């Protein structure tokens, strides 16, 4: 997250760190949202690599013991059937991970609330992106969970020539683009929390940014629109 602030350790309990085994250690690669005690929602591009993954819930500082972490392996990965690794702009950047064990819920580990199918946010809706991603374009990962206020940019505006044009699809949510704050490498797969009816719900799965950089004016961070996949999500969980 570029231009973020450190999140309080109990603000976003559904946020998880998706890590892969590298040598004798583990490396954070993406974010994710805990949606069931044994299911995590993330981006398809985060797991279309042949690596061994683990999920860490109740995480705050990637480099220090917080005394709240739970580590669990990934048992099954279900990527959306239409996902194409070399066509991120097409959409379908979403995947579900079934955990080897069911995590224990507490103040640091909670299920993320998903919006009702078809829900579209009004332009400039209040949302926060969270993650341990790079704090600057071509920079380095954050040690502590970061959050950044990223108001939504509706489809009509986001798909206009000055913004993303046809690159953005209606199956996506755009947020930010003020040139100062944005998601960045390492935040992918994580949540975009938006306040609706007094409750925060996860409306997006962090997907991509501009080739020009993470924080680029009129190039808001792009997320997979969760409300466009509610049926798919329920179908996968119910059959696995």
């Amino acid at each position: 997250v570029v231009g973020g602030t450190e999140a309080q350790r109990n603000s976003w309990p559904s946020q998880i760190s998706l890590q892969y085994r590298s040598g004798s250690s583990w490396a954070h690669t993406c974010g994710g949202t805990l949606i069931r005690q044994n299911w995590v929602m993330t981006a398809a591009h985060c797991v279309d690599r042949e690596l061994t993954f683990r999920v860490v819930v109740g995480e705050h500082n990637l480099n220090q013991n917080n005394g709240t972490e739970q580590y669990v392996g990934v048992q099954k990965i279900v990527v959306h059937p239409y996902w194409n690794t070399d066509d991120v702009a097409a959409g379908y950047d979403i995947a579900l991970l079934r955990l080897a064990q069911s995590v224990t819920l507490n103040s640091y580990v909670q299920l993320g609330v998903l919006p009702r199918a078809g829900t579209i946010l009004r332009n400039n809706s209040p949302c926060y992106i969270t993650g341990w991603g790079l704090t600057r374009t071509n920079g380095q990962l954050a040690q502590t969970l970061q959050q950044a206020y990223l108001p939504t940019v509706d489809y009509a505006i986001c798909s206009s020539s000055s913004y993303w044009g046809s690159t953005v699809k209606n199956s996506m949510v755009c947020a930010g683009g003020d040139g100062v704050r944005s998601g960045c490498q390492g935040d992918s797969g994580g949540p975009l929390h938006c306040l609706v009816n007094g409750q925060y719900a996860v409306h997006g799965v962090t997907s991509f940014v501009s080739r020009l950089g993470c924080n680029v004016t009129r190039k808001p961070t792009v997320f997979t629109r969760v409300s466009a996949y509610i049926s798919w999500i329920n179908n996968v969980i119910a059959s696995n």
Partner: peptide, 4 residues
């Protein structure tokens, strides 16, 4: 685009 750049996946993040």
């Amino acid at each position: 685009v750049e996946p993040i």
